[PDB]
């Protein structure tokens, strides 16, 4: 029974890309992409998103 | 086949936290000489 | 048939340079305007932006600040080496460390 | 409630991030 | 502790 | 030894410990003509032995000792510098975007010399801030640190401005007094230089800091100041007609 | 800029002497004479430095104090609110507002 | 519904005063090139025409120097940290005219 | 202008400004 | 998979409008006589003289 | 997975050190009006607890 | 800033009002000199 | 079966800490480096790039820049409480 | 400047801050044991008079004052206005 | 040149 | 006294 400050999916249509400063890319692994990566031997390593919170070790 | 509902425990905040108005300038408090109004509490929005 | 032109400027294996010198000349490794009084006594922030042809493949910028990276290495006694690193405009260490 | 400051970031010699007079 | 206000200490006095 | 402060340091007697770490990651050490991921499809580099190798100059000790006590002096101290001699600042661009601003908070520029930049494809730039990078699947040439650059023509143009509003072409000099123009696409002013679609201010800012020519006639520079990674060596215009 | 900036200001009469003053006394008479035709008035700026000290506080005084009734009755023919004004010290109300 | 902006360190000396407005992007030129090919509009550009008409939409502004201080300063205000220009949650009582 | 293969916040993040509803899009009051 | 579905679109700080041509909108622009253009697309990275 | 932040130029004459945590937006009261028509949490509030 | 959500690309306006004096000082028969200044928001190199 | 050991360290009810001392210790209160920011009146700009494990609910990082928050209350003559709030490392109030 | 003469960042040159004995020695054995690449000569740039502030365009544009056309020739009548205190080496 | 090494015209 | 501006 209140409003929603009339938030209805801000729509980026006229795109002047990047209307927000850019924050030099930090130097480490998992802060560039969200790709399926790879391990030394050749096993697949899941994207940086999830499944890499509970570290798995043999 | 029914079951009991979840247990809900309504209760005041620990140390009645939040009841008073702190760190929220807007509705802040005051302490001064009744005839020399000069606050004793000036609040920032960042003091938690 | 009729015809409308097109042109590019393919330039690869080279990096763009915007030297800090007043007249953009190679008048010295430590530039003329670099030593100027105004920049030598009062720091400045910087805002500066680029264009890019839209490439659907994600891409990341690459910028350098042409900063002195000098080093001095001295050996006082047999078997002891002492070094001093420095980066005048972008020093790698200051009073906070 | 003088919420005092105390801190002035200037810069040895004492010019503050600045910008000078453009001349023709 | 040591000195005026409890300064965590580094007043081992090597004095000329 | 590629490190500048160690590349050609002249050592003195005394025993020195010297250890270094070698990347065993196959993908980031071998090049491939297709840029295909190597550690997935199959690859391996097993190290066997690592030995340091040095060649002393058999200087007569009579003079070697003098050279010793002579480089031992304070004022006689050595000094080196990295060649590229400049910081590195990566800036991630959105997958597909038109522009990108950056910002550096107030900072001294006592001995600044100039900016140099380019573009990279993020799939092929390794974040070497960690001993390993499982997400570096690309295998081909890495423009980050392999001299390669092949996109530093997609920049339409660049702008600079000191702290909010002090643009640094300067008290107006360039044909576009504030906008470094590199790919200006439509002309009524005819600012595009060569029969290409450069700008006659950029091709006065380049080939004027690289070959230090300009203000006195644009003549082809001699090869002893035009190196392999120089500007002119690689500049290339072209054109056709389309129906 | 300087840590004072006063000089760097006065050289634009941005906050300094008034035009009647810096103008060479010869010119001022000429501009005060031919002012009903060809007036040299709207081109030699003045100043406008406003009072630095002793005009504003630093320690208190919400601009618009909010007093609440200390009394209220609904007679259906009136509403007798009884406020409590507490104009403080070094502080004046000018009961207009 | 928010536009956080910032300005690097300055010598905010005479800084006299801010002044906002809000312009529809369709009608505001690109005056840095000449012949901005993307001005498909005639109308009345409220950027060099003084025809500002969108100020009826603003709700709050917040000046903060050095990322800590607040320029409507020591409390001088009613909302001592956030300039209120449009209260749509009326309550305590502020809301001037009718 | 997709941000796939994208990092996850390539942009300086500014104050949650402590106001009243610049916090989310949701329902609310009594 | 990141959906800004519960935030106030604008967390990230904003920068001065570049103030040059081209990048302020990406809707078809018109040339002096009417021949349109592309806002942020390819075919605008080539010197299309006449 | 990343969240860069920045602070403009400052002096840290007496800076002591940082501290941080992580909170859920649905439980984080905003204190600028004494009433948040968007706080919809009855549970514990880490911000001020 | 807080801005009502308007369903179209928009643009703020941030006039940092500041002093913008100019000084013209032609000291010879044909030399129009000048010295611009903008105190809090100048853009002058030197 | 074979096994893939998973590890996880739950540490709640505490706030992550990174003191400002040179050696990361609590030698004093006005940390060593604190006083070490001599060079007189000089400044510094901070940057920070926290990572997180992607959650599925809008979160708010709560960095806690710490600084002294001393306030000296004073009562000169019977009825006037004069206070002086002088937070340091991230100051407040325009009343030097 | 010190903290700049210390790194020879800009200061006396390699042949004039080394102990003169070492200049002599390096000149003696440069043909087989070169030591000139170990000590870096600093190299500053002229900082006073060789760049102007008074706002001078870097490159100028000139339009034809007038012209003609004979169906074979095409005359262009340019007015090369070089400002006072400038030199425009007509090569450029 | 000059003798603080390289340069050009602060020497006539 | 001492205030007004000019």
PDB file of N, CA and C in Angstrom, chain C residues 11-72:
ATOM      1  N   UNK C  11      46.724   1.175 -38.739  1.00  0.00           N
ATOM      2  CA  UNK C  11      48.018   1.448 -38.127  1.00  0.00           C
ATOM      3  C   UNK C  11      48.173   0.527 -36.932  1.00  0.00           C
ATOM      4  N   UNK C  12      49.074  -0.441 -37.044  1.00  0.00           N
ATOM      5  CA  UNK C  12      49.191  -1.496 -36.055  1.00  0.00           C
ATOM      6  C   UNK C  12      50.634  -1.590 -35.593  1.00  0.00           C
ATOM      7  N   UNK C  13      50.823  -2.239 -34.448  1.00  0.00           N
ATOM      8  CA  UNK C  13      52.146  -2.407 -33.861  1.00  0.00           C
ATOM      9  C   UNK C  13      52.755  -1.064 -33.474  1.00  0.00           C
ATOM     10  N   UNK C  14      51.908  -0.064 -33.257  1.00  0.00           N
ATOM     11  CA  UNK C  14      52.353   1.242 -32.794  1.00  0.00           C
ATOM     12  C   UNK C  14      51.343   1.798 -31.809  1.00  0.00           C
ATOM     13  N   UNK C  15      51.833   2.509 -30.807  1.00  0.00           N
ATOM     14  CA  UNK C  15      50.980   3.104 -29.798  1.00  0.00           C
ATOM     15  C   UNK C  15      50.891   4.609 -30.001  1.00  0.00           C
ATOM     16  N   UNK C  16      49.684   5.136 -29.850  1.00  0.00           N
ATOM     17  CA  UNK C  16      49.496   6.573 -29.922  1.00  0.00           C
ATOM     18  C   UNK C  16      50.284   7.262 -28.814  1.00  0.00           C
ATOM     19  N   UNK C  17      50.802   8.446 -29.129  1.00  0.00           N
ATOM     20  CA  UNK C  17      51.589   9.213 -28.175  1.00  0.00           C
ATOM     21  C   UNK C  17      51.061  10.634 -28.114  1.00  0.00           C
ATOM     22  N   UNK C  18      50.942  11.163 -26.905  1.00  0.00           N
ATOM     23  CA  UNK C  18      50.528  12.546 -26.694  1.00  0.00           C
ATOM     24  C   UNK C  18      51.536  13.183 -25.749  1.00  0.00           C
ATOM     25  N   UNK C  19      52.725  13.525 -26.225  1.00  0.00           N
ATOM     26  CA  UNK C  19      53.770  14.003 -25.317  1.00  0.00           C
ATOM     27  C   UNK C  19      53.342  15.261 -24.581  1.00  0.00           C
ATOM     28  N   UNK C  20      53.779  15.364 -23.332  1.00  0.00           N
ATOM     29  CA  UNK C  20      53.433  16.485 -22.470  1.00  0.00           C
ATOM     30  C   UNK C  20      54.166  17.766 -22.829  1.00  0.00           C
ATOM     31  N   UNK C  21      55.097  17.729 -23.775  1.00  0.00           N
ATOM     32  CA  UNK C  21      55.849  18.930 -24.099  1.00  0.00           C
ATOM     33  C   UNK C  21      54.914  20.011 -24.624  1.00  0.00           C
ATOM     34  N   UNK C  22      55.329  21.264 -24.445  1.00  0.00           N
ATOM     35  CA  UNK C  22      54.471  22.386 -24.810  1.00  0.00           C
ATOM     36  C   UNK C  22      54.150  22.378 -26.297  1.00  0.00           C
ATOM     37  N   UNK C  23      55.159  22.154 -27.133  1.00  0.00           N
ATOM     38  CA  UNK C  23      54.998  22.142 -28.581  1.00  0.00           C
ATOM     39  C   UNK C  23      54.956  20.731 -29.153  1.00  0.00           C
ATOM     40  N   UNK C  24      54.827  19.720 -28.296  1.00  0.00           N
ATOM     41  CA  UNK C  24      54.754  18.322 -28.706  1.00  0.00           C
ATOM     42  C   UNK C  24      56.020  17.860 -29.414  1.00  0.00           C
ATOM     43  N   UNK C  25      57.176  18.331 -28.969  1.00  0.00           N
ATOM     44  CA  UNK C  25      58.443  17.966 -29.576  1.00  0.00           C
ATOM     45  C   UNK C  25      59.259  17.129 -28.601  1.00  0.00           C
ATOM     46  N   UNK C  26      60.155  16.313 -29.153  1.00  0.00           N
ATOM     47  CA  UNK C  26      61.062  15.504 -28.343  1.00  0.00           C
ATOM     48  C   UNK C  26      62.244  16.376 -27.939  1.00  0.00           C
ATOM     49  N   UNK C  27      61.964  17.349 -27.077  1.00  0.00           N
ATOM     50  CA  UNK C  27      62.962  18.307 -26.632  1.00  0.00           C
ATOM     51  C   UNK C  27      63.715  17.837 -25.399  1.00  0.00           C
ATOM     52  N   UNK C  28      63.453  16.633 -24.934  1.00  0.00           N
ATOM     53  CA  UNK C  28      64.131  16.090 -23.775  1.00  0.00           C
ATOM     54  C   UNK C  28      63.281  15.039 -23.101  1.00  0.00           C
ATOM     55  N   UNK C  29      63.959  14.049 -22.526  1.00  0.00           N
ATOM     56  CA  UNK C  29      63.256  12.958 -21.864  1.00  0.00           C
ATOM     57  C   UNK C  29      62.342  13.495 -20.774  1.00  0.00           C
ATOM     58  N   UNK C  30      62.841  14.436 -19.983  1.00  0.00           N
ATOM     59  CA  UNK C  30      62.008  15.117 -19.004  1.00  0.00           C
ATOM     60  C   UNK C  30      61.498  16.406 -19.636  1.00  0.00           C
ATOM     61  N   UNK C  31      60.212  16.438 -19.958  1.00  0.00           N
ATOM     62  CA  UNK C  31      59.684  17.396 -20.913  1.00  0.00           C
ATOM     63  C   UNK C  31      59.775  18.825 -20.400  1.00  0.00           C
ATOM     64  N   UNK C  32      59.724  19.760 -21.350  1.00  0.00           N
ATOM     65  CA  UNK C  32      59.675  21.176 -21.012  1.00  0.00           C
ATOM     66  C   UNK C  32      58.532  21.464 -20.053  1.00  0.00           C
ATOM     67  N   UNK C  33      57.301  21.274 -20.512  1.00  0.00           N
ATOM     68  CA  UNK C  33      56.139  21.564 -19.687  1.00  0.00           C
ATOM     69  C   UNK C  33      56.082  20.698 -18.441  1.00  0.00           C
ATOM     70  N   UNK C  34      56.745  19.542 -18.442  1.00  0.00           N
ATOM     71  CA  UNK C  34      56.732  18.704 -17.256  1.00  0.00           C
ATOM     72  C   UNK C  34      57.344  19.394 -16.054  1.00  0.00           C
ATOM     73  N   UNK C  35      58.468  20.067 -16.252  1.00  0.00           N
ATOM     74  CA  UNK C  35      59.143  20.772 -15.173  1.00  0.00           C
ATOM     75  C   UNK C  35      58.528  22.124 -14.879  1.00  0.00           C
ATOM     76  N   UNK C  36      57.457  22.492 -15.573  1.00  0.00           N
ATOM     77  CA  UNK C  36      56.904  23.827 -15.411  1.00  0.00           C
ATOM     78  C   UNK C  36      56.511  24.052 -13.956  1.00  0.00           C
ATOM     79  N   UNK C  37      56.576  25.314 -13.534  1.00  0.00           N
ATOM     80  CA  UNK C  37      56.311  25.642 -12.139  1.00  0.00           C
ATOM     81  C   UNK C  37      54.926  25.182 -11.713  1.00  0.00           C
ATOM     82  N   UNK C  38      53.924  25.375 -12.569  1.00  0.00           N
ATOM     83  CA  UNK C  38      52.551  25.108 -12.160  1.00  0.00           C
ATOM     84  C   UNK C  38      52.340  23.642 -11.808  1.00  0.00           C
ATOM     85  N   UNK C  39      52.913  22.726 -12.587  1.00  0.00           N
ATOM     86  CA  UNK C  39      52.748  21.306 -12.315  1.00  0.00           C
ATOM     87  C   UNK C  39      53.744  20.779 -11.293  1.00  0.00           C
ATOM     88  N   UNK C  40      54.766  21.552 -10.950  1.00  0.00           N
ATOM     89  CA  UNK C  40      55.776  21.097 -10.009  1.00  0.00           C
ATOM     90  C   UNK C  40      55.480  21.492  -8.573  1.00  0.00           C
ATOM     91  N   UNK C  41      54.466  22.320  -8.336  1.00  0.00           N
ATOM     92  CA  UNK C  41      54.150  22.779  -6.995  1.00  0.00           C
ATOM     93  C   UNK C  41      52.732  22.466  -6.555  1.00  0.00           C
ATOM     94  N   UNK C  42      51.834  22.127  -7.475  1.00  0.00           N
ATOM     95  CA  UNK C  42      50.438  21.905  -7.133  1.00  0.00           C
ATOM     96  C   UNK C  42      49.874  20.804  -8.012  1.00  0.00           C
ATOM     97  N   UNK C  43      49.587  19.662  -7.403  1.00  0.00           N
ATOM     98  CA  UNK C  43      49.105  18.515  -8.153  1.00  0.00           C
ATOM     99  C   UNK C  43      47.806  18.846  -8.876  1.00  0.00           C
ATOM    100  N   UNK C  44      47.401  17.949  -9.771  1.00  0.00           N
ATOM    101  CA  UNK C  44      46.162  18.082 -10.522  1.00  0.00           C
ATOM    102  C   UNK C  44      45.537  16.708 -10.707  1.00  0.00           C
ATOM    103  N   UNK C  45      44.213  16.660 -10.636  1.00  0.00           N
ATOM    104  CA  UNK C  45      43.478  15.469 -11.028  1.00  0.00           C
ATOM    105  C   UNK C  45      43.371  15.458 -12.550  1.00  0.00           C
ATOM    106  N   UNK C  46      42.554  14.567 -13.105  1.00  0.00           N
ATOM    107  CA  UNK C  46      42.462  14.479 -14.556  1.00  0.00           C
ATOM    108  C   UNK C  46      41.205  13.725 -14.944  1.00  0.00           C
ATOM    109  N   UNK C  47      40.485  14.254 -15.927  1.00  0.00           N
ATOM    110  CA  UNK C  47      39.359  13.576 -16.550  1.00  0.00           C
ATOM    111  C   UNK C  47      39.581  13.574 -18.052  1.00  0.00           C
ATOM    112  N   UNK C  48      39.427  12.410 -18.675  1.00  0.00           N
ATOM    113  CA  UNK C  48      39.851  12.299 -20.060  1.00  0.00           C
ATOM    114  C   UNK C  48      39.264  11.024 -20.643  1.00  0.00           C
ATOM    115  N   UNK C  49      38.622  11.151 -21.802  1.00  0.00           N
ATOM    116  CA  UNK C  49      37.748  10.114 -22.326  1.00  0.00           C
ATOM    117  C   UNK C  49      38.071   9.839 -23.785  1.00  0.00           C
ATOM    118  N   UNK C  50      37.697   8.649 -24.250  1.00  0.00           N
ATOM    119  CA  UNK C  50      37.994   8.214 -25.606  1.00  0.00           C
ATOM    120  C   UNK C  50      36.738   7.799 -26.350  1.00  0.00           C
ATOM    121  N   UNK C  51      36.857   7.772 -27.670  1.00  0.00           N
ATOM    122  CA  UNK C  51      35.904   7.111 -28.545  1.00  0.00           C
ATOM    123  C   UNK C  51      36.412   5.728 -28.914  1.00  0.00           C
ATOM    124  N   UNK C  52      35.514   4.924 -29.469  1.00  0.00           N
ATOM    125  CA  UNK C  52      35.856   3.593 -29.946  1.00  0.00           C
ATOM    126  C   UNK C  52      34.773   3.142 -30.906  1.00  0.00           C
ATOM    127  N   UNK C  53      35.182   2.536 -32.012  1.00  0.00           N
ATOM    128  CA  UNK C  53      34.204   1.873 -32.849  1.00  0.00           C
ATOM    129  C   UNK C  53      33.600   0.700 -32.083  1.00  0.00           C
ATOM    130  N   UNK C  54      32.297   0.581 -32.084  1.00  0.00           N
ATOM    131  CA  UNK C  54      31.665  -0.501 -31.326  1.00  0.00           C
ATOM    132  C   UNK C  54      32.089  -1.873 -31.816  1.00  0.00           C
ATOM    133  N   UNK C  55      32.784  -2.619 -30.963  1.00  0.00           N
ATOM    134  CA  UNK C  55      33.111  -4.014 -31.220  1.00  0.00           C
ATOM    135  C   UNK C  55      32.297  -4.895 -30.285  1.00  0.00           C
ATOM    136  N   UNK C  56      31.474  -5.771 -30.857  1.00  0.00           N
ATOM    137  CA  UNK C  56      30.631  -6.624 -30.032  1.00  0.00           C
ATOM    138  C   UNK C  56      31.436  -7.534 -29.118  1.00  0.00           C
ATOM    139  N   UNK C  57      32.676  -7.799 -29.446  1.00  0.00           N
ATOM    140  CA  UNK C  57      33.526  -8.594 -28.571  1.00  0.00           C
ATOM    141  C   UNK C  57      34.037  -7.713 -27.437  1.00  0.00           C
ATOM    142  N   UNK C  58      33.891  -8.120 -26.177  1.00  0.00           N
ATOM    143  CA  UNK C  58      34.318  -7.250 -25.077  1.00  0.00           C
ATOM    144  C   UNK C  58      35.770  -6.839 -25.236  1.00  0.00           C
ATOM    145  N   UNK C  59      36.041  -5.569 -24.958  1.00  0.00           N
ATOM    146  CA  UNK C  59      37.382  -5.037 -25.119  1.00  0.00           C
ATOM    147  C   UNK C  59      37.691  -4.106 -23.962  1.00  0.00           C
ATOM    148  N   UNK C  60      38.978  -3.968 -23.669  1.00  0.00           N
ATOM    149  CA  UNK C  60      39.418  -3.137 -22.565  1.00  0.00           C
ATOM    150  C   UNK C  60      40.490  -2.177 -23.049  1.00  0.00           C
ATOM    151  N   UNK C  61      40.464  -0.977 -22.485  1.00  0.00           N
ATOM    152  CA  UNK C  61      41.361   0.095 -22.870  1.00  0.00           C
ATOM    153  C   UNK C  61      42.797  -0.272 -22.514  1.00  0.00           C
ATOM    154  N   UNK C  62      43.714   0.640 -22.826  1.00  0.00           N
ATOM    155  CA  UNK C  62      45.109   0.502 -22.422  1.00  0.00           C
ATOM    156  C   UNK C  62      45.747   1.876 -22.486  1.00  0.00           C
ATOM    157  N   UNK C  63      46.184   2.389 -21.345  1.00  0.00           N
ATOM    158  CA  UNK C  63      46.721   3.738 -21.252  1.00  0.00           C
ATOM    159  C   UNK C  63      48.018   3.702 -20.465  1.00  0.00           C
ATOM    160  N   UNK C  64      48.990   4.495 -20.898  1.00  0.00           N
ATOM    161  CA  UNK C  64      50.239   4.667 -20.177  1.00  0.00           C
ATOM    162  C   UNK C  64      50.444   6.129 -19.821  1.00  0.00           C
ATOM    163  N   UNK C  65      51.112   6.349 -18.699  1.00  0.00           N
ATOM    164  CA  UNK C  65      51.555   7.673 -18.297  1.00  0.00           C
ATOM    165  C   UNK C  65      53.072   7.664 -18.286  1.00  0.00           C
ATOM    166  N   UNK C  66      53.667   8.466 -19.158  1.00  0.00           N
ATOM    167  CA  UNK C  66      55.064   8.276 -19.532  1.00  0.00           C
ATOM    168  C   UNK C  66      55.917   8.782 -18.375  1.00  0.00           C
ATOM    169  N   UNK C  67      56.119   7.927 -17.378  1.00  0.00           N
ATOM    170  CA  UNK C  67      56.646   8.309 -16.073  1.00  0.00           C
ATOM    171  C   UNK C  67      58.069   7.801 -15.929  1.00  0.00           C
ATOM    172  N   UNK C  68      58.960   8.663 -15.444  1.00  0.00           N
ATOM    173  CA  UNK C  68      60.314   8.232 -15.125  1.00  0.00           C
ATOM    174  C   UNK C  68      60.280   7.037 -14.189  1.00  0.00           C
ATOM    175  N   UNK C  69      61.068   6.017 -14.518  1.00  0.00           N
ATOM    176  CA  UNK C  69      61.172   4.798 -13.722  1.00  0.00           C
ATOM    177  C   UNK C  69      62.595   4.573 -13.234  1.00  0.00           C
ATOM    178  N   UNK C  70      63.263   5.633 -12.779  1.00  0.00           N
ATOM    179  CA  UNK C  70      64.693   5.549 -12.523  1.00  0.00           C
ATOM    180  C   UNK C  70      64.986   4.593 -11.376  1.00  0.00           C
ATOM    181  N   UNK C  71      66.254   4.194 -11.292  1.00  0.00           N
ATOM    182  CA  UNK C  71      66.750   3.294 -10.263  1.00  0.00           C
ATOM    183  C   UNK C  71      68.230   3.563 -10.057  1.00  0.00           C
ATOM    184  N   UNK C  72      68.656   3.528  -8.801  1.00  0.00           N
ATOM    185  CA  UNK C  72      70.059   3.687  -8.453  1.00  0.00           C
ATOM    186  C   UNK C  72      70.475   2.527  -7.566  1.00  0.00           C
TER     187      UNK C  72
END
